[PDB]
From Swiss-Prot:
Belongs to the glycosyl hydrolase 22 family. It is found in: Secreted. Lysozymes have primarily a bacteriolytic function; those in tissues and body fluids are associated with the monocyte-macrophage system and enhance the activity of immunoagents. Has bacteriolytic activity against M.luteus. The active site is at E35, D52. One of its GO terms (molecular function) is lysozyme activity. This is Lysozyme C. It catalyses: Hydrolysis of (1->4)-beta-linkages between N-acetylmuramic acid and N-acetyl-D-glucosamine residues in a peptidoglycan and between N-acetyl-D-glucosamine residues in chitodextrins.
Length: 129
């Protein structure tokens, strides 16, 4: 499913992401925009052979099992395909674990390079929340 900007913002808010670990809603919406363009079905293969899945492009090396990433860890205890569902609950629950990992949102390279330090509030501007 390809989410609309305000639609996603509202879904994330409902799932408790607004200010989770100190990160305002605009940060999560900005990260989703640049990581997957709001597409739940987005996947991208990495050079090390692992693959990124879903709206938040969660990596198979540590977070989910895809059955093809040798020696990976599956910290979120889910098959990576669950991360591509139109229901974002799995992606959200796993993102919460990742952001709590100590590195915060820097875990997402697109957030670090394109969202960090920018007017992220602009991403929820105009939305009925």
């Amino acid at each position: 499913k390809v989410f609309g900007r305000c639609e996603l913002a509202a879904a994330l808010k409902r799932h408790g992401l607004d200010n989770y670990r100190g990160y305002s809603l605009g940060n999560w919406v900005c990260a989703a925009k640049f990581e997957s363009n709001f597409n739940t079905q987005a996947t991208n293969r990495n050079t090390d052979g692992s693959t990124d899945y879903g709206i938040f492009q969660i990596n198979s090396r540590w977070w989910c099992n895809d059955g093809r990433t040798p020696g990976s860890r599956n910290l979120c205890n889910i098959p990576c395909s669950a991360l591509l569902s139109s229901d974002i609950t799995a992606s959200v629950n796993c993102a919460k674990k990742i952001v709590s990992d100590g590195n915060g949102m820097n875990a997402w390279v697109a957030w670090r390079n394109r969202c960090k330090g920018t007017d992220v509030q602009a991403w929820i501007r105009g939305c009925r929340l």
